[model samples]
Target chain A: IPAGELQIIDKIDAAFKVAATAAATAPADDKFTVFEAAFNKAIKETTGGAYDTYKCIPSLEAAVKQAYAATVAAAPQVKYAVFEAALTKAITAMSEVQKVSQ
Target chain B: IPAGELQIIDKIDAAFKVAATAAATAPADDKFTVFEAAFNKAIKETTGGAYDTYKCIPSLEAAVKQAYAATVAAAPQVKYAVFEAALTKAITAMSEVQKVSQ
Candidate 1:
Protein backbone atom coordinates (compact mmCIF):
# COMPACT_ATOMS: atom_id res chain seq x y z
CA ILE A 1 0.00 0.00 0.00
CA PRO A 2 1.32 3.42 -0.89
CA ALA A 3 1.28 6.09 1.74
CA GLY A 4 -0.11 8.27 -1.00
CA GLU A 5 -2.96 5.83 -1.63
CA LEU A 6 -3.75 5.09 2.01
CA GLN A 7 -2.99 8.66 3.04
CA ILE A 8 -0.31 7.21 5.27
CA ILE A 9 2.67 9.46 5.76
CA ASP A 10 5.56 7.63 7.32
CA LYS A 11 8.83 5.94 6.42
CA ILE A 12 7.46 2.65 7.84
CA ASP A 13 4.70 2.47 5.25
CA ALA A 14 7.33 1.80 2.58
CA ALA A 15 8.49 -1.38 4.32
CA PHE A 16 5.02 -2.28 5.58
CA LYS A 17 3.81 -2.73 2.02
CA VAL A 18 6.43 -5.32 1.25
CA ALA A 19 6.65 -7.20 4.53
CA ALA A 20 2.96 -7.26 5.44
CA THR A 21 1.92 -8.25 1.94
CA ALA A 22 4.23 -11.25 2.13
CA ALA A 23 2.99 -11.88 5.65
CA ALA A 24 -0.19 -13.59 4.62
CA THR A 25 -0.19 -17.36 4.40
CA ALA A 26 -3.88 -17.80 3.73
CA PRO A 27 -6.95 -15.82 2.76
CA ALA A 28 -8.96 -14.48 5.65
CA ASP A 29 -11.19 -11.43 5.54
CA ASP A 30 -9.76 -10.33 8.85
CA LYS A 31 -5.97 -10.30 8.67
CA PHE A 32 -5.52 -9.90 12.42
CA THR A 33 -6.86 -13.38 13.17
CA VAL A 34 -4.17 -14.73 10.91
CA PHE A 35 -1.75 -12.27 12.52
CA GLU A 36 -2.52 -13.07 16.16
CA ALA A 37 -2.25 -16.78 15.55
CA ALA A 38 0.94 -16.43 13.53
CA PHE A 39 2.80 -14.15 15.94
CA ASN A 40 1.64 -16.20 18.90
CA LYS A 41 3.75 -18.89 17.31
CA ALA A 42 6.64 -16.51 16.64
CA ILE A 43 6.73 -15.13 20.16
CA LYS A 44 6.44 -18.60 21.64
CA GLU A 45 8.90 -20.59 19.53
CA THR A 46 12.39 -21.61 20.59
CA THR A 47 13.90 -22.41 17.17
CA GLY A 48 14.77 -18.73 16.69
CA GLY A 49 15.00 -17.82 20.34
CA ALA A 50 11.64 -17.16 21.92
CA TYR A 51 9.77 -13.96 22.85
CA ASP A 52 6.42 -13.21 24.45
CA THR A 53 3.41 -12.53 22.22
CA TYR A 54 1.50 -10.44 24.75
CA LYS A 55 4.38 -8.93 26.62
CA CYS A 56 3.15 -5.37 26.70
CA ILE A 57 -0.43 -6.44 27.29
CA PRO A 58 -1.57 -2.84 27.58
CA SER A 59 0.36 -1.62 24.56
CA LEU A 60 -0.73 -4.50 22.38
CA GLU A 61 -4.29 -3.90 23.52
CA ALA A 62 -4.10 -0.23 22.70
CA ALA A 63 -2.41 -0.99 19.43
CA VAL A 64 -5.06 -3.53 18.55
CA LYS A 65 -7.93 -1.11 19.13
CA GLN A 66 -6.15 1.80 17.51
CA ALA A 67 -4.97 -0.32 14.63
CA TYR A 68 -8.32 -1.99 13.97
CA ALA A 69 -10.23 1.25 14.24
CA ALA A 70 -7.86 2.87 11.81
CA THR A 71 -8.01 -0.01 9.35
CA VAL A 72 -11.76 0.09 9.29
CA ALA A 73 -12.24 3.81 9.64
CA ALA A 74 -9.43 4.45 7.19
CA ALA A 75 -7.83 2.07 4.69
CA PRO A 76 -7.20 -1.69 4.66
CA GLN A 77 -3.46 -1.35 4.92
CA VAL A 78 -3.46 1.07 7.83
CA LYS A 79 -3.91 -1.54 10.53
CA TYR A 80 -0.86 -3.50 9.44
CA ALA A 81 1.37 -0.58 10.23
CA VAL A 82 -0.40 0.08 13.51
CA PHE A 83 -0.46 -3.52 14.67
CA GLU A 84 3.05 -4.39 13.54
CA ALA A 85 4.50 -1.34 15.27
CA ALA A 86 2.56 -2.02 18.48
CA LEU A 87 3.25 -5.75 18.58
CA THR A 88 6.94 -5.19 18.03
CA LYS A 89 7.06 -2.52 20.67
CA ALA A 90 5.24 -4.72 23.17
CA ILE A 91 7.41 -7.76 22.51
CA THR A 92 10.59 -5.73 22.53
CA ALA A 93 9.62 -4.14 25.83
CA MET A 94 9.38 -7.55 27.47
CA SER A 95 12.49 -8.74 25.72
CA GLU A 96 14.36 -6.29 27.85
CA VAL A 97 12.69 -7.65 30.98
CA GLN A 98 13.39 -11.21 29.94
CA LYS A 99 16.97 -10.22 29.16
CA VAL A 100 17.63 -8.57 32.51
CA SER A 101 16.67 -11.73 34.32
CA GLN A 102 18.60 -14.23 32.20
CA ILE B 1 -1.98 -32.08 13.79
CA PRO B 2 -3.20 -34.94 15.95
CA ALA B 3 -2.65 -35.27 19.64
CA GLY B 4 -1.34 -38.76 19.09
CA GLU B 5 1.06 -37.35 16.55
CA LEU B 6 1.81 -34.30 18.66
CA GLN B 7 1.81 -35.99 22.08
CA ILE B 8 -0.73 -33.37 23.02
CA ILE B 9 -3.34 -34.05 25.69
CA ASP B 10 -6.03 -31.45 25.39
CA LYS B 11 -9.40 -30.76 23.85
CA ILE B 12 -8.35 -27.56 22.07
CA ASP B 13 -6.08 -29.43 19.70
CA ALA B 14 -9.06 -30.75 17.81
CA ALA B 15 -10.19 -27.26 16.81
CA PHE B 16 -6.68 -25.86 16.70
CA LYS B 17 -5.70 -28.09 13.78
CA VAL B 18 -8.49 -26.81 11.60
CA ALA B 19 -8.36 -23.10 12.60
CA ALA B 20 -4.60 -22.74 12.61
CA THR B 21 -4.13 -24.60 9.30
CA ALA B 22 -6.55 -22.27 7.54
CA ALA B 23 -4.80 -19.48 9.39
CA ALA B 24 -2.05 -19.53 6.81
CA THR B 25 -2.55 -17.38 3.73
CA ALA B 26 0.98 -17.83 2.47
CA PRO B 27 4.02 -19.95 3.12
CA ALA B 28 6.54 -19.01 5.73
CA ASP B 29 8.65 -21.50 7.64
CA ASP B 30 7.66 -19.25 10.52
CA LYS B 31 3.91 -19.01 11.14
CA PHE B 32 4.04 -16.24 13.74
CA THR B 33 5.27 -13.65 11.24
CA VAL B 34 2.05 -14.22 9.37
CA PHE B 35 0.07 -14.34 12.62
CA GLU B 36 1.36 -11.13 14.21
CA ALA B 37 0.90 -9.21 11.00
CA ALA B 38 -2.54 -10.68 10.48
CA PHE B 39 -3.89 -10.22 14.01
CA ASN B 40 -2.43 -6.74 14.10
CA LYS B 41 -4.91 -6.08 11.33
CA ALA B 42 -7.73 -7.92 13.06
CA ILE B 43 -7.18 -6.17 16.33
CA LYS B 44 -6.75 -2.81 14.71
CA GLU B 45 -9.25 -2.94 11.89
CA THR B 46 -12.71 -1.42 12.16
CA THR B 47 -14.11 -3.68 9.46
CA GLY B 48 -16.41 -5.64 11.75
CA GLY B 49 -15.84 -3.23 14.56
CA ALA B 50 -12.55 -3.33 16.45
CA TYR B 51 -10.82 -4.78 19.45
CA ASP B 52 -7.41 -4.32 21.01
CA THR B 53 -4.77 -6.67 19.57
CA TYR B 54 -2.37 -6.34 22.45
CA LYS B 55 -4.92 -6.06 25.25
CA CYS B 56 -3.63 -8.76 27.53
CA ILE B 57 -0.29 -8.64 25.88
CA PRO B 58 1.05 -10.39 28.96
CA SER B 59 -1.14 -13.40 28.43
CA LEU B 60 -0.51 -13.25 24.71
CA GLU B 61 3.19 -13.03 25.39
CA ALA B 62 3.21 -16.06 27.64
CA ALA B 63 1.04 -18.01 25.28
CA VAL B 64 3.22 -17.16 22.30
CA LYS B 65 6.44 -18.22 24.00
CA GLN B 66 4.96 -21.43 25.33
CA ALA B 67 3.26 -22.18 22.04
CA TYR B 68 6.32 -21.57 19.84
CA ALA B 69 8.68 -23.38 22.17
CA ALA B 70 6.56 -26.49 22.14
CA THR B 71 6.09 -26.40 18.38
CA VAL B 72 9.80 -26.13 17.78
CA ALA B 73 10.96 -28.25 20.72
CA ALA B 74 8.31 -30.87 20.24
CA ALA B 75 5.78 -31.04 17.44
CA PRO B 76 4.81 -28.54 14.75
CA GLN B 77 1.25 -28.20 15.98
CA VAL B 78 1.86 -27.53 19.64
CA LYS B 79 2.25 -23.77 19.37
CA TYR B 80 -1.16 -23.25 17.83
CA ALA B 81 -3.01 -24.58 20.83
CA VAL B 82 -0.88 -22.63 23.26
CA PHE B 83 -0.92 -19.41 21.29
CA GLU B 84 -4.61 -19.57 20.44
CA ALA B 85 -5.60 -20.27 23.99
CA ALA B 86 -3.48 -17.50 25.43
CA LEU B 87 -4.47 -14.94 22.82
CA THR B 88 -8.13 -15.67 23.32
CA LYS B 89 -7.81 -15.40 27.05
CA ALA B 90 -5.96 -12.12 26.82
CA ILE B 91 -8.40 -10.68 24.30
CA THR B 92 -11.34 -11.96 26.25
CA ALA B 93 -9.97 -10.48 29.42
CA MET B 94 -10.01 -7.08 27.81
CA SER B 95 -13.28 -7.72 26.06
CA GLU B 96 -14.84 -7.52 29.48
CA VAL B 97 -13.19 -4.18 30.05
CA GLN B 98 -14.16 -2.84 26.64
CA LYS B 99 -17.72 -4.05 27.11
CA VAL B 100 -18.12 -2.37 30.46
CA SER B 101 -17.18 0.96 28.95
CA GLN B 102 -19.70 0.55 26.19
Candidate 2:
Protein backbone atom coordinates (compact mmCIF):
# COMPACT_ATOMS: atom_id res chain seq x y z
CA ILE A 1 0.00 0.00 0.00
CA PRO A 2 2.82 2.34 0.93
CA ALA A 3 4.65 1.56 -2.27
CA GLY A 4 1.54 2.15 -4.33
CA GLU A 5 0.82 5.43 -2.60
CA LEU A 6 4.43 6.52 -2.95
CA GLN A 7 4.39 5.77 -6.67
CA ILE A 8 1.29 7.87 -7.15
CA ILE A 9 2.75 10.64 -5.04
CA ASP A 10 5.92 10.67 -7.12
CA LYS A 11 3.94 10.95 -10.33
CA ILE A 12 1.88 13.81 -8.87
CA ASP A 13 5.03 15.56 -7.71
CA ALA A 14 6.56 15.21 -11.12
CA ALA A 15 3.50 16.65 -12.81
CA PHE A 16 3.40 19.54 -10.37
CA LYS A 17 7.07 20.26 -10.93
CA VAL A 18 6.56 20.22 -14.66
CA ALA A 19 3.66 22.64 -14.40
CA ALA A 20 5.63 24.83 -12.03
CA THR A 21 8.63 24.99 -14.29
CA ALA A 22 6.47 25.89 -17.28
CA ALA A 23 4.80 28.62 -15.27
CA ALA A 24 8.13 29.96 -14.07
CA THR A 25 9.51 30.37 -17.55
CA ALA A 26 6.48 31.70 -19.38
CA PRO A 27 6.59 35.20 -20.86
CA ALA A 28 3.10 36.27 -19.81
CA ASP A 29 1.44 36.62 -16.40
CA ASP A 30 -1.59 34.77 -17.67
CA LYS A 31 0.66 31.77 -17.96
CA PHE A 32 0.65 31.51 -14.24
CA THR A 33 -3.12 31.64 -14.09
CA VAL A 34 -3.38 28.91 -16.67
CA PHE A 35 -0.90 26.81 -14.80
CA GLU A 36 -2.79 27.31 -11.59
CA ALA A 37 -6.01 26.25 -13.18
CA ALA A 38 -4.42 23.19 -14.67
CA PHE A 39 -2.77 22.35 -11.40
CA ASN A 40 -6.01 22.76 -9.53
CA LYS A 41 -7.80 20.55 -12.01
CA ALA A 42 -5.17 17.88 -11.77
CA ILE A 43 -5.36 17.82 -8.00
CA LYS A 44 -9.12 17.97 -7.89
CA GLU A 45 -9.55 15.11 -10.31
CA THR A 46 -6.85 12.99 -8.78
CA THR A 47 -7.73 13.47 -5.13
CA GLY A 48 -11.38 14.14 -5.60
CA GLY A 49 -10.58 17.35 -3.79
CA ALA A 50 -9.15 15.58 -0.76
CA TYR A 51 -6.25 17.81 0.30
CA ASP A 52 -6.21 21.17 2.04
CA THR A 53 -5.86 24.20 -0.15
CA TYR A 54 -2.80 25.22 1.78
CA LYS A 55 -2.70 27.33 -1.41
CA CYS A 56 1.00 27.13 -0.76
CA ILE A 57 2.04 27.16 -4.38
CA PRO A 58 4.09 30.24 -5.33
CA SER A 59 1.59 31.39 -7.92
CA LEU A 60 -1.13 31.63 -5.29
CA GLU A 61 0.95 33.20 -2.53
CA ALA A 62 0.13 36.73 -3.57
CA ALA A 63 -3.57 36.01 -3.47
CA VAL A 64 -3.21 34.38 -0.09
CA LYS A 65 -1.32 37.40 1.17
CA GLN A 66 -3.99 39.64 -0.22
CA ALA A 67 -6.65 37.61 1.54
CA TYR A 68 -4.75 37.67 4.83
CA ALA A 69 -4.40 41.42 4.60
CA ALA A 70 -8.07 42.02 3.91
CA THR A 71 -9.27 39.69 6.64
CA VAL A 72 -6.94 40.73 9.41
CA ALA A 73 -8.56 44.13 9.83
CA ALA A 74 -12.29 43.74 10.34
CA ALA A 75 -12.89 40.02 10.42
CA PRO A 76 -14.18 38.31 13.54
CA GLN A 77 -11.81 36.21 15.62
CA VAL A 78 -12.83 32.94 14.04
CA LYS A 79 -12.67 34.34 10.55
CA TYR A 80 -9.43 36.18 11.13
CA ALA A 81 -7.98 33.09 12.71
CA VAL A 82 -8.83 31.01 9.68
CA PHE A 83 -7.04 33.48 7.49
CA GLU A 84 -4.06 33.44 9.78
CA ALA A 85 -4.03 29.68 9.81
CA ALA A 86 -4.19 29.50 6.04
CA LEU A 87 -1.22 31.80 5.65
CA THR A 88 0.79 29.84 8.12
CA LYS A 89 0.04 26.66 6.23
CA ALA A 90 0.87 28.30 2.92
CA ILE A 91 4.19 29.54 4.13
CA THR A 92 5.10 26.20 5.57
CA ALA A 93 4.12 24.29 2.43
CA MET A 94 5.74 26.73 0.01
CA SER A 95 8.96 26.68 1.98
CA GLU A 96 9.19 22.94 1.50
CA VAL A 97 8.68 23.24 -2.25
CA GLN A 98 11.35 25.90 -2.32
CA LYS A 99 13.72 23.80 -0.31
CA VAL A 100 13.19 20.84 -2.54
CA SER A 101 13.86 22.93 -5.62
CA GLN A 102 17.01 24.29 -4.10
CA ILE B 1 -13.43 25.54 -10.05
CA PRO B 2 -11.55 27.54 -7.49
CA ALA B 3 -14.50 27.69 -5.12
CA GLY B 4 -15.25 24.03 -5.66
CA GLU B 5 -11.66 23.04 -5.09
CA LEU B 6 -11.52 25.18 -1.99
CA GLN B 7 -14.57 23.49 -0.58
CA ILE B 8 -13.05 20.10 -1.15
CA ILE B 9 -9.77 21.19 0.35
CA ASP B 10 -11.50 22.43 3.48
CA LYS B 11 -13.40 19.20 3.88
CA ILE B 12 -10.25 17.17 3.34
CA ASP B 13 -8.44 19.31 5.87
CA ALA B 14 -11.19 18.76 8.41
CA ALA B 15 -11.12 15.01 7.89
CA PHE B 16 -7.35 14.95 8.28
CA LYS B 17 -7.58 16.94 11.47
CA VAL B 18 -10.15 14.61 12.92
CA ALA B 19 -8.03 11.59 12.09
CA ALA B 20 -4.99 13.31 13.49
CA THR B 21 -6.71 14.05 16.77
CA ALA B 22 -7.93 10.50 17.06
CA ALA B 23 -4.46 9.14 16.41
CA ALA B 24 -2.82 11.58 18.78
CA THR B 25 -4.68 10.24 21.80
CA ALA B 26 -4.78 6.51 21.16
CA PRO B 27 -3.29 4.22 23.84
CA ALA B 28 -1.42 2.11 21.29
CA ASP B 29 1.01 2.84 18.45
CA ASP B 30 -1.11 0.86 16.01
CA LYS B 31 -3.58 3.73 16.00
CA PHE B 32 -1.16 5.76 13.90
CA THR B 33 -0.98 3.06 11.28
CA VAL B 34 -4.72 2.89 11.06
CA PHE B 35 -4.94 6.62 10.80
CA GLU B 36 -2.29 6.61 8.09
CA ALA B 37 -4.19 4.01 6.11
CA ALA B 38 -7.44 5.91 6.45
CA PHE B 39 -5.73 9.13 5.50
CA ASN B 40 -4.08 7.49 2.51
CA LYS B 41 -7.36 6.01 1.38
CA ALA B 42 -9.12 9.34 1.74
CA ILE B 43 -6.46 11.04 -0.33
CA LYS B 44 -6.43 8.30 -2.93
CA GLU B 45 -10.17 8.38 -3.34
CA THR B 46 -10.45 12.12 -3.16
CA THR B 47 -7.56 12.98 -5.46
CA GLY B 48 -7.25 9.69 -7.28
CA GLY B 49 -3.60 9.64 -6.15
CA ALA B 50 -2.73 13.01 -7.60
CA TYR B 51 -0.78 14.79 -4.84
CA ASP B 52 2.77 14.08 -3.77
CA THR B 53 3.31 11.89 -0.71
CA TYR B 54 4.45 14.83 1.37
CA LYS B 55 4.13 12.35 4.26
CA CYS B 56 4.46 15.34 6.52
CA ILE B 57 1.75 14.21 8.84
CA PRO B 58 3.08 13.67 12.38
CA SER B 59 2.00 10.07 12.43
CA LEU B 60 4.31 9.28 9.50
CA GLU B 61 7.23 11.48 10.50
CA ALA B 62 9.02 8.70 12.29
CA ALA B 63 8.86 6.45 9.25
CA VAL B 64 10.03 9.28 7.02
CA LYS B 65 12.89 9.95 9.40
CA GLN B 66 13.87 6.33 9.38
CA ALA B 67 13.74 6.25 5.59
CA TYR B 68 15.78 9.43 5.39
CA ALA B 69 18.42 8.11 7.74
CA ALA B 70 18.87 4.91 5.82
CA THR B 71 18.93 6.59 2.44
CA VAL B 72 21.24 9.48 3.34
CA ALA B 73 24.10 7.09 4.00
CA ALA B 74 24.56 4.61 1.19
CA ALA B 75 22.29 5.98 -1.47
CA PRO B 76 23.66 7.55 -4.66
CA GLN B 77 23.36 11.27 -5.22
CA VAL B 78 20.15 10.98 -7.19
CA LYS B 79 18.66 8.51 -4.75
CA TYR B 80 19.73 10.40 -1.67
CA ALA B 81 18.45 13.58 -3.23
CA VAL B 82 15.01 12.08 -3.78
CA PHE B 83 14.80 11.18 -0.12
CA GLU B 84 15.88 14.67 0.82
CA ALA B 85 13.27 16.15 -1.48
CA ALA B 86 10.53 13.96 -0.06
CA LEU B 87 11.45 14.98 3.47
CA THR B 88 11.42 18.63 2.50
CA LYS B 89 7.95 18.32 1.08
CA ALA B 90 6.72 16.31 4.05
CA ILE B 91 8.08 18.84 6.50
CA THR B 92 6.50 21.70 4.65
CA ALA B 93 3.10 20.03 4.32
CA MET B 94 3.07 18.79 7.89
CA SER B 95 4.03 22.22 9.19
CA GLU B 96 0.96 23.66 7.50
CA VAL B 97 -1.24 21.09 9.21
CA GLN B 98 0.40 21.85 12.53
CA LYS B 99 -0.03 25.60 12.06
CA VAL B 100 -3.67 25.10 11.20
CA SER B 101 -4.14 23.06 14.34
CA GLN B 102 -2.56 25.75 16.46
Candidate 3:
Protein backbone atom coordinates (compact mmCIF):
# COMPACT_ATOMS: atom_id res chain seq x y z
CA ILE A 1 0.00 0.00 0.00
CA PRO A 2 1.15 3.58 -0.62
CA ALA A 3 2.26 5.74 2.27
CA GLY A 4 -0.95 7.74 2.07
CA GLU A 5 -3.14 4.65 2.19
CA LEU A 6 -1.00 3.28 4.99
CA GLN A 7 -1.69 6.45 6.93
CA ILE A 8 -5.40 6.01 6.49
CA ILE A 9 -5.33 2.47 7.83
CA ASP A 10 -2.86 3.31 10.57
CA LYS A 11 -0.84 0.62 12.41
CA ILE A 12 -3.81 -1.71 12.14
CA ASP A 13 -3.49 -1.78 8.39
CA ALA A 14 0.27 -2.03 8.50
CA ALA A 15 -0.08 -5.09 10.73
CA PHE A 16 -2.50 -6.65 8.28
CA LYS A 17 -0.25 -5.70 5.39
CA VAL A 18 2.44 -7.76 6.97
CA ALA A 19 -0.06 -10.61 7.22
CA ALA A 20 -1.17 -10.00 3.66
CA THR A 21 2.42 -10.39 2.56
CA ALA A 22 2.69 -13.66 4.46
CA ALA A 23 -0.54 -15.10 3.02
CA ALA A 24 0.36 -14.04 -0.51
CA THR A 25 3.82 -15.47 -0.15
CA ALA A 26 2.80 -18.84 1.27
CA PRO A 27 -0.55 -19.62 -0.32
CA ALA A 28 -1.02 -22.01 2.55
CA ASP A 29 -1.99 -21.40 6.16
CA ASP A 30 -4.60 -18.91 5.04
CA LYS A 31 -7.38 -19.99 7.32
CA PHE A 32 -9.10 -17.01 8.88
CA THR A 33 -10.56 -19.08 11.69
CA VAL A 34 -7.20 -20.54 12.55
CA PHE A 35 -5.57 -17.15 12.29
CA GLU A 36 -8.27 -15.61 14.41
CA ALA A 37 -7.96 -18.36 16.97
CA ALA A 38 -4.23 -17.90 17.29
CA PHE A 39 -4.60 -14.15 17.29
CA ASN A 40 -7.34 -14.12 19.90
CA LYS A 41 -5.34 -16.45 22.08
CA ALA A 42 -2.32 -14.24 21.85
CA ILE A 43 -4.41 -11.16 22.46
CA LYS A 44 -6.02 -12.78 25.43
CA GLU A 45 -2.67 -13.76 26.82
CA THR A 46 -1.18 -10.37 26.06
CA THR A 47 -3.99 -8.40 27.60
CA GLY A 48 -4.33 -10.70 30.59
CA GLY A 49 -7.48 -12.22 29.08
CA ALA A 50 -9.21 -8.90 29.41
CA TYR A 51 -9.85 -8.21 25.71
CA ASP A 52 -12.72 -9.79 23.87
CA THR A 53 -13.95 -9.70 20.26
CA TYR A 54 -17.08 -7.89 21.39
CA LYS A 55 -14.87 -4.99 22.27
CA CYS A 56 -12.24 -5.81 19.67
CA ILE A 57 -10.99 -2.40 18.60
CA PRO A 58 -10.87 -0.78 22.00
CA SER A 59 -9.47 -3.94 23.56
CA LEU A 60 -6.81 -4.01 20.88
CA GLU A 61 -5.90 -0.44 21.70
CA ALA A 62 -5.54 -1.46 25.33
CA ALA A 63 -3.24 -4.30 24.34
CA VAL A 64 -1.03 -1.92 22.40
CA LYS A 65 -0.82 0.26 25.43
CA GLN A 66 0.45 -2.68 27.45
CA ALA A 67 3.01 -3.64 24.81
CA TYR A 68 4.31 -0.09 24.51
CA ALA A 69 4.95 -0.03 28.25
CA ALA A 70 8.25 -1.78 27.51
CA THR A 71 10.65 -0.51 24.85
CA VAL A 72 12.27 -3.95 24.63
CA ALA A 73 8.98 -5.64 23.86
CA ALA A 74 10.35 -5.56 20.31
CA ALA A 75 7.27 -7.05 18.66
CA PRO A 76 4.53 -6.16 21.11
CA GLN A 77 1.55 -8.35 21.69
CA VAL A 78 -0.62 -5.70 20.08
CA LYS A 79 0.96 -6.29 16.67
CA TYR A 80 -0.56 -9.76 16.75
CA ALA A 81 -4.06 -8.31 16.70
CA VAL A 82 -3.16 -5.99 13.86
CA PHE A 83 -1.72 -8.89 11.91
CA GLU A 84 -4.86 -10.90 12.60
CA ALA A 85 -7.03 -8.23 11.05
CA ALA A 86 -4.68 -7.85 8.12
CA LEU A 87 -4.55 -11.61 7.41
CA THR A 88 -8.29 -11.96 7.79
CA LYS A 89 -8.76 -9.57 4.91
CA ALA A 90 -5.90 -11.08 2.96
CA ILE A 91 -7.19 -14.62 3.55
CA THR A 92 -10.67 -13.68 2.42
CA ALA A 93 -9.18 -12.27 -0.75
CA MET A 94 -6.98 -15.34 -1.14
CA SER A 95 -7.81 -18.73 -2.71
CA GLU A 96 -8.79 -22.04 -1.07
CA VAL A 97 -5.56 -23.90 -1.70
CA GLN A 98 -3.71 -20.98 -0.18
CA LYS A 99 -5.16 -21.76 3.22
CA VAL A 100 -3.24 -24.60 4.80
CA SER A 101 -2.02 -27.20 2.30
CA GLN A 102 -2.13 -30.78 3.47
CA ILE B 1 3.86 -28.17 2.42
CA PRO B 2 3.79 -31.13 4.79
CA ALA B 3 6.30 -31.70 7.53
CA GLY B 4 7.90 -34.31 5.27
CA GLU B 5 8.01 -31.86 2.40
CA LEU B 6 9.35 -29.24 4.75
CA GLN B 7 12.13 -31.64 5.70
CA ILE B 8 13.01 -32.27 2.07
CA ILE B 9 13.66 -28.63 1.26
CA ASP B 10 15.33 -27.98 4.59
CA LYS B 11 14.98 -24.60 6.30
CA ILE B 12 15.31 -22.77 3.01
CA ASP B 13 11.98 -24.06 1.71
CA ALA B 14 10.38 -23.29 5.04
CA ALA B 15 11.76 -19.80 4.68
CA PHE B 16 10.42 -19.52 1.12
CA LYS B 17 7.16 -21.09 2.17
CA VAL B 18 6.81 -18.16 4.51
CA ALA B 19 7.50 -15.93 1.53
CA ALA B 20 5.10 -17.90 -0.63
CA THR B 21 2.44 -17.33 1.98
CA ALA B 22 3.33 -13.67 1.86
CA ALA B 23 3.16 -13.50 -1.94
CA ALA B 24 -0.06 -15.44 -2.20
CA THR B 25 -1.55 -13.27 0.51
CA ALA B 26 -0.32 -10.08 -1.12
CA PRO B 27 -0.11 -11.02 -4.86
CA ALA B 28 1.31 -7.63 -5.80
CA ASP B 29 5.04 -8.17 -5.55
CA ASP B 30 5.61 -10.96 -8.04
CA LYS B 31 8.62 -9.52 -9.76
CA PHE B 32 11.08 -12.38 -9.76
CA THR B 33 13.77 -10.04 -11.00
CA VAL B 34 13.39 -7.76 -8.01
CA PHE B 35 13.28 -10.76 -5.73
CA GLU B 36 16.48 -12.12 -7.24
CA ALA B 37 18.23 -8.77 -7.07
CA ALA B 38 17.34 -8.18 -3.44
CA PHE B 39 18.24 -11.74 -2.54
CA ASN B 40 21.63 -11.49 -4.23
CA LYS B 41 22.38 -8.18 -2.61
CA ALA B 42 21.52 -9.53 0.82
CA ILE B 43 23.62 -12.60 0.18
CA LYS B 44 26.56 -10.45 -0.83
CA GLU B 45 26.15 -8.27 2.21
CA THR B 46 25.91 -11.24 4.52
CA THR B 47 28.99 -12.80 3.04
CA GLY B 48 30.90 -9.55 3.40
CA GLY B 49 30.46 -8.99 -0.37
CA ALA B 50 32.89 -11.80 -1.02
CA TYR B 51 30.59 -14.27 -2.70
CA ASP B 52 29.54 -15.02 -6.31
CA THR B 53 26.19 -16.34 -7.49
CA TYR B 54 27.89 -19.22 -9.26
CA LYS B 55 28.88 -20.42 -5.83
CA CYS B 56 25.58 -19.38 -4.37
CA ILE B 57 24.63 -22.48 -2.38
CA PRO B 58 28.07 -22.83 -0.85
CA SER B 59 28.26 -19.15 -0.05
CA LEU B 60 24.91 -19.39 1.69
CA GLU B 61 26.21 -22.33 3.63
CA ALA B 62 29.13 -20.20 4.70
CA ALA B 63 26.86 -17.49 5.94
CA VAL B 64 24.76 -19.99 7.81
CA LYS B 65 27.97 -21.24 9.30
CA GLN B 66 28.81 -17.80 10.60
CA ALA B 67 25.30 -17.26 11.95
CA TYR B 68 25.60 -20.55 13.80
CA ALA B 69 29.09 -20.01 15.09
CA ALA B 70 27.51 -18.45 18.11
CA THR B 71 25.57 -20.69 20.45
CA VAL B 72 22.67 -18.33 20.28
CA ALA B 73 22.71 -15.37 17.94
CA ALA B 74 18.97 -15.24 18.31
CA ALA B 75 17.82 -14.22 14.83
CA PRO B 76 21.17 -13.51 13.24
CA GLN B 77 21.83 -10.93 10.57
CA VAL B 78 22.17 -13.83 8.12
CA LYS B 79 18.45 -14.61 8.14
CA TYR B 80 18.03 -11.91 5.49
CA ALA B 81 19.70 -14.23 2.97
CA VAL B 82 17.29 -17.08 3.60
CA PHE B 83 14.40 -14.65 3.46
CA GLU B 84 15.73 -13.31 0.17
CA ALA B 85 15.88 -16.72 -1.49
CA ALA B 86 12.48 -17.62 -0.11
CA LEU B 87 10.99 -14.44 -1.50
CA THR B 88 12.63 -15.00 -4.88
CA LYS B 89 10.90 -18.33 -5.33
CA ALA B 90 7.74 -17.02 -3.75
CA ILE B 91 7.67 -14.00 -6.07
CA THR B 92 8.15 -16.13 -9.18
CA ALA B 93 5.44 -18.50 -8.06
CA MET B 94 3.16 -15.60 -7.16
CA SER B 95 1.15 -13.12 -9.21
CA GLU B 96 1.85 -9.44 -9.63
CA VAL B 97 0.77 -6.66 -7.24
CA GLN B 98 1.74 -8.47 -4.03
CA LYS B 99 5.16 -6.94 -3.45
CA VAL B 100 4.11 -3.33 -3.23
CA SER B 101 1.07 -1.25 -4.02
CA GLN B 102 1.09 2.15 -5.68
lDDT tens digits, residues B38-59, model 2? 5566655555565433263334
Candidate number that wins on TM-score, 1 or 2: 1
DockQ of each: 0.16, 0.01, 0.16
lDDT string, candidate 3, B25-91, tens digits: 3333452334344445544444455543312454334443443343142222213323433334333
Model 1 agreement with the true structure over B1-102: per-residue lDDT tens digits? 222312211212222233344454545345665556555454344223333452323444455565455445322322443354344443344444444544
Q: Which ten residues in a row have the lowest lDDT in candidate 2 chain A?
A: A75-84
Strongest candidate by TM-score: 1
DockQ of model 2, rounded to 2 decimals: 0.01
Task: Write model 1 residue lDDT over A1-102, tens digit each, in one string.
Answer: 222212211212222233344455445455666566554454344223323443323443454465455445323323443344444443344444444544
Q: How well is each residue in A1-102 modelled by candidate 3, as lDDT tens digits?
A: 223322223334334344334433332344334444444554445445554431265433443344334324322212332333333333233323233331
Which structure among the candidates has the greatest lDDT? 2
Residue A15, model 3: lDDT of: 42
lDDT of each: 0.41, 0.43, 0.36
RMSD of 2: 21.5
